[PDB]
Each structure stands twice: as structure tokens, then as C-alpha cells.
Paper text:
The sliding β-clamp polymerase processivity factor adopts a doughnut-like ring shaped structure where the DNA passes through the positively charged inner hollow of the clamp. The β-clamp itself has to be loaded onto DNA with the help of the multi-protein clamp loader complex. It recruits various factors like DNA polymerases, ligases, and other DNA interacting/processing proteins to the ‘scene of action’. Structures of β-clamps are known from diverse sources including E. coli, T. maritima and S. pyogenes till date.
The structure was solved using molecular replacement (MR) techniques employing the structure of the E. coli clamp as the model for the calculations. Structurally it is similar to those of the clamps from other sources like E. coli, S. pyogenes and T. maritima. The crystal structure reveals the details of the positively charged inner ring that is involved in DNA recognition and the hydrophobic binding site that is involved in the recognition of partner proteins. The structural conservation of the Mtbβ-Clamp as seen in the crystal structures is not surprising, especially for a protein performing an important role in various pathways involving DNA. The comparative studies demonstrate that the peptide and DNA recognition region(s) in the Mtbβ-Clamp is well conserved compared to other clamps and no obvious differences could be detected in these sites to ascribe the lack of interactions of the Mtbβ-Clamp with the LigA. We find that the mycobacterial clamp also has specific affinity for DNA and exhibits about 1.8 times higher affinity for primed DNA compared to nicked and dsDNA respectively. However the affinity of both homologs for blunt dsDNA is similar with Kd 453 and 557 nM for the E. coli and M. tuberculosis clamps respectively. The results therefore suggest that other as-yet-unidentified factors/mechanisms may mediate interactions between these proteins and DNA.
Author numbering:
A (entry chain A): 8 to 402
B (entry chain B): 10 to 402
Write the structure that this text describes.
């Protein structure tokens, strides 16, 4: 259907990219068989590939000499496999009605065709709500996404919380053992904009790589009194764009959970501390736990087991407060430590049954008021925080 | 008096240890066998592993400040040895526990009873030797064609045949035959037996031949090359033994073509890419087909969607038009192994094995109207024989 049949000439380099970006979303085995197709559409002077699985929906637009408009549905994985395995010659697509003739050099393909009238019109895309640099959005989404619950038996934990307080945005995710919070400055579209939504975590992290080009990605939730309404979020920028259906769940109150002051405060090198963790945990005890003895200007981490496999390492910590001994799940620990994206790290303990607080450290800012070992230290502002619960094992 | 203790460079300790755990992997049957055995003596340390089939043993130069031996869990040692800094490592048996120390890293590993470890095999007398890099190349070329399936051994081994001065390697999964011909320096120029060694055990030992620049097979010598039911690869610091396989192996020289009705010659590079591409639509991967005509071949797979792909490339061909079908993996496996610039096919009919062999420089490549009627087999040191394929309706 359409009247004519689609035919075009794309550069392959460009065809292959556009196609993979669309299959990287909506993977899996879609529920209704049709949804496994992608949709190519020639018009104006550009081609648009489109995918849709009812939750997410991607769509790329590449510049291609179309020598005849139309649209066709063709199996999506097959197109992606072929597009990546082809030479680097220009590729000649041409619908011979019911079959797609694909040609690139002396390679010739005859793919079957899916009924382009069972494809259910991918969503529209709410009105722009603001924008921010693409590389910064990526960094910010990775930092927060680690702490998101990967388990499907329970959503809510599976989302990133996006809160907009016009001009600043804050990202937060949590699996119940970690909290990652990122604070951000974007260019809003209505400087009095003010809502908060919950978007599925992977859908969002995936779209943080369609932000390499664009050098400026744009969130589209809605504008004004209808930012919530319109049950979805839209990431656009460069040639790519996507929508993900928002998550209808309430998310931990969460500012309540942060420390106001810390009884102890440490500061060692991230590099060294990671290596030291990956090493003592080899004997870990099914990987369960690593422990940190904090004293004077040194910390001794140590795991050990049912063989009593015992390992320990000592490194120098710029410490302040009374000797403290705390235990962490070693993965949660290194996850947080990778994310700080910094040279060195700063721990903030209340007691040893209460969340440690990791945040980054670049240059000797503070210290400053870190001499008075005998009593509470200030929280101190920061744009990235990782809150890590301490761990317990049974006998 | 005191228990083993020593000082190794880590770089050297880590290598020696991994080489011993790369063999005898899995979950050994008797629990003890999961340990490795460190032994200090003379002025060298030797790690030893053993699983009843294979048995490796590396020897590294280490300042031992006290001789002895201890058994410690093998995977744990390998994990630790690879995760340690680059400082010198201080092992020291505090009897019942091994104290391992490398910088400010300190480990206290448990100890296994070194008297349940069952004395690893002795190693038959040297039978010959050949360059290590050539032995590796030759083992990879022949090993692809070996059957990976355990329901049936025999297909699982490489056939090593020695005809003093020349050795030949052969493996087969029943659909491919790879044969490699080799010149080594024997120990008794009238040496003459043939044995079957498990295929992986041998390919694994083809990487403990990077150093040594000269690896040495030890089956026995004279009238007792067969007897002594095992093979021994040594060289550099490493050495291993593998228990030989007691099976008869396809008669196999019978299966080669004397003459070919057709003979083709195209570029290996182009042909591989072309195969990997048309097989995307392959039909569960089952088959690729080659139409041979004049000076061009058109490969093409297609399916139940009829997913149809095809590509045309230029073949230096000689004989009457032929159309043959191969399993595409078997095909590219063979094609990788030729280790050559270009390839030469040798077809009898189209229900009979093609013959792949390498081509470097215009020695004989069609060479015109030889011609049409039968072509010569032509000697070669590496041959890949690939059965054509059939699918059911």
C-alpha cells in the first residue's frame, strides 16, 4: 500500500548506524510478531527507520537519496545483521513489491516483506521541556544507573527518578542498598518548570549513547501544567530520537536518608582502593563481604572465610575521627567507587550500622575543618553522592 | 627446622602457575586433585598438576631459602597470583597454612595433605624435537577438523604418525579431514610408529611452545615407542604428559583424490567474507552453495522465508561447470587453516569431497587447457578434505 514502491541509495556507513540504534532498543522477542519488523520510510530527501515495542520506540533519520517514496516493513534483526556485514560500498535498496532487493557491490539480497499496515503508529512525542549537553547527560546517567535495581519481580527500584526544579535537574536511582544522586544544570523551556517522573532505567541509559552526536540532547516531557500528563518521556538530538513510557510508581522519599553530619570522615585514593578490594575479595566467602578497620592514618581491609581463606591489605587513609570498623558488599563498594569519576574519594560514616557516604574529591578543598576528631563534621555540598548500606552475614 | 619457603618474581610465579591450571581444569574427580604442588629444592621451584589423564609441571627460577613441598588449592593460587602487584612475592609455609606476601598484601591460604597427592607420571624417553612455532602452527591446522563430541572418542584425537625424519598429523570429525606433513629431528633415524593423542591436551601444549623455540616429543625410543602408554611434550621451562588414546583411526590415505575433474583457485580473504555474508540468511546456518562456471563463482544461501542472498566473485577455474554445496563453517574453518594467500579446490564429482590446499605464487594454477579431462593431485604439506552437504525437504 502507498501507490508507488520505495527505492533509495544510502551510504551503508550511515545506513548501518541508523539501523542498529533502532534495534538496540525494543530487543527481545516482541509479544506480537509484527513488532519484530522495522519500518523504513522514504520521503522529502531523507529516510527514517522506526521501531516500536509498546514500551519504547526509537526512530533514526539519515540523509539518503530517495529516488522513489514509499514505506516497507522488514525483519529488524536480519536487516541489522546484513547492514553490519556489508562492504563499504553504497547500498541500493529497492522494493520489488512484496520483497526488498538489497544491493551493495556484487552482494545481492532478497528479503521478504512484512505487512506495513499492521504496524501500529509509533507515539508522537511530547513538547520540548529542556536540553543539556550530550556528553554530560551520558556521564550523569551512568553514575546514577549502577544503583538501580535490575530485578523485575519489583519495579520502582527499576527506574531512575528524574526531578526537574527548573534550571536544576536531579537524578536518583536505588536498589535498596545503594542510592546514587546526581545534580545537574540544564537550559529549561519555562524557567518555572517543576515536576518529577520515574523512567525505566535501561531505556534511559541506552539513549545516553545516541548522545555522542547532537552535542546537545533534549528531554521532552511536556511543558507548563502538563509535564506529568502525556504519560511518556522523549529523548531527541542529532539524528536519533526515542520515547519511553513512564513508570507509574512512588519512589523513596530519599533526601531524608542523607547524613547532616558525620562522626568520622576518611579520604584515600580511588585507584589504590579498588585494586585492594578486588584483591582481598578473591578469598571473600562466596564474595559476600569485605571489612575496613579504620585507625589513625591507615585502613586495613580484609576478607576471609570457611577455609578461613584470610587475606588483608593495608593502605594509607587521610582519616579524621575515632577508630571505626565497617563492612561492605565488595561489589556495591566498587560500583560506587567507579562512578565518582574522580581522582580520590571521601567517606562519611555516622555509626557502623548506618550508610556510608561516598563523594568525589579533587584538590585539597576540605579538610579545612577536619582537625576536631572529637566531634561531628559538616555534610558539605556535592553534585554526586553514593550512599552505601553496610552489610551483615548469618553464622 | 622449617617447611618450604621462597622468593619468586611474581611475573615468573604467575606464568608458571597458570600454565599448570590451564591443563587439568574442570572439577577433578577426587578432591585432592584440585591442588597444585609446589616443591623447593636445588635452586628452583616446580609447580605440578595432575588429573589422571594429563599432568603438567612448570619449573621457574626462584631463590628458595628453605626446601620442602606443599599442596595448595590450584584455582585460588592462580587467581591470587594474577591479581597481585608486580613486587616480589614471599611464600612461606607456617606449617598447615601458606603465608603469601607481596608488598602490603598478605594472604593466609589453607593447606592440603601433600601425602594424598599420587606421584605424577615419569615421562618416557625423548623421541625427537622440532621448532616450537612450527609445532603450534601445525597443531592448529589439524585440530579444527577433530571431533569435539565425547559420546565418541577416536574422532576426538589427533593421529600422530612418525616415519623417522617426517611426521604426519591427521584429525577428522567424519566431515573434514585435516592432514599436516612435517620435518623434525628424530632420535633414531629409523623410528616408526603411530599413536592417537586427545586433541585438546595437545593444542593446549602448543602454547607452552613460545619459549623453548624447540619443543620435544617423548613417546619412547626404538621398539618401545608405542609401549609406555603416553606422550610427553617438553621445552623451555614447561613440560606435560597426556595418556594416549587406545583407538583405531580411519585408514585415511585411501580417502584422498588421485586426480580431479575440476580445479578452482580464488582469493582466501574475499572468499571468507563472501561466505560469512551470504550465510546470514543461511537457513539455521545449514548450507552455502557454489555455482562454478568459466571464470566466476556465485555463492548463495536462501531459505524458508526464502531469505535469498548471493555474491559473485572471480575464480581462476578449469574444468566443466560444477555446482556444489558446503556447510559454511566447515568451509571457513578449512579456509582459515590454509594459512595462505589464496586457495585451491579439487573436485571430483559433487557428492564427493572437495580438496582444499594452499597456493603461494603461480606454481600451477589451472595453467590453461591442461586440460578439461582429469588434473593431477599435486603434492602438498597441508590438505583439508571437506565433504559436501545435504538437507531434507
Amino acid at each position: 500500500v502507498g501507490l508507488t514502491d520505495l527505492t533509495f541509495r544510502l551510504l551503508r556507513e550511515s545506513f548501518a548506524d541508523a539501523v542498529s540504534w533502532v534495534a538496540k532498543n525494543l530487543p527481545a522477542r516482541p509479544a506480537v510478531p509484527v513488532l519484530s519488523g522495522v519500518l523504513l520510510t522514504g520521503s522529502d530527501n531523507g529516510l527514517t527507520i522506526s521501531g516500536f515495542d509498546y514500551e519504547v520506540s526509537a526512530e533514526a533519520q539519515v540523509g539518503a537519496e530517495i529516488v522513489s517514496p514509499g514505506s516497507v516493513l522488514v525483519s529488524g534483526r536480519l536487516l541489522s545483521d546484513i547492514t553490519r556485514a556489508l562492504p563499504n560500498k553504497p547500498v541500493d535498496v529497492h522494493v520489488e513489491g512484496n520483497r526488498v532487493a538489497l544491493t551493495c557491490g556484487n552482494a545481492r539480497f532478497s528479503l521478504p516483506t512484512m505487512p506495513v499496515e499492521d504496524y501500529p503508529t509509533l507515539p508522537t512525542l511530547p513538547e520540548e521541556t529542556g536540553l543539556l549537553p550530550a556528553e554530560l547527560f551520558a556521564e550523569a546517567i551512568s553514575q546514577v544507573a549502577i544503583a538501580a535495581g535490575r530485578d523485575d519481580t519489583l519495579p520502582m527500584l527499576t527506574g531512575i527518578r528524574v526531578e526537574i526544579l527548573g534550571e536544576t535537574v536531579v537524578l536518583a536511582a536505588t536498589d535498596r542498598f545503594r542510592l546514587a544522586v546526581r545534580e545537574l544544570k540544564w537550559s529549561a523551556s519555562s524557567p518555572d518548570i517543576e515536576a518529577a517522573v520515574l523512567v525505566p532505567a535501561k531505556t534511559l541509559a541506552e539513549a545516553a549513547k545516541a548522545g555522542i552526536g547532537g552535542s546537545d540532547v533534549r528531554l521532552s516531557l511536556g511543558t507548563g501544567p502538563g509535564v506529568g500528563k502525556d504519560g511518556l518521556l522523549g529523548i531527541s538530538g542529532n539524528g536519533k530520537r526515542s520515547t519511553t513510557r513512564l513508570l507509574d510508581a512512588e519512589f523513596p522519599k530519599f533526601r531524608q536518608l542523607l547524613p547532616t553530619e558525620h562522626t568520622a570522615v576518611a579520604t584515600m585514593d580511588v585507584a589504590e582502593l579498588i585494586e585492594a578490594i578486588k584483591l582481598v575479595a578473591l578469598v571473600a566467602d562466596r564474595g559476600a563481604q569485605v571489612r575496613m578497620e579504620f585507625a589513625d592514618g591507615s585502613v586495613r581491609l580484609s576478607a576471609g572465610a570457611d577455609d578461613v581463606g584470610r587475606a588483608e591489605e593495608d593502605l594509607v587513609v587521610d582519616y579524621a575521627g575515632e577508630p571505626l570498623t565497617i563492612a561492605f558488599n565488595p561489589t556495591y563498594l566498587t560500583d560506587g567507587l567507579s562512578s565518582l569519576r574522580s581522582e580520590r574519594v571521601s567517606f562519611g560514616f555516622t555509626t557502623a550500622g548506618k550508610p556510608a557516604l561516598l563523594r568525589p574529591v579533587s584538590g585539597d578543598d576540605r579538610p579545612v575543618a577536619g582537625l576536631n576528631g572529637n566531634g561531628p563534621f559538616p555534610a558539605v555540598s556535592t553534585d554526586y553522592v553514593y550512599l552505601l548500606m553496610p552489610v551483615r552475614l548469618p553464622g
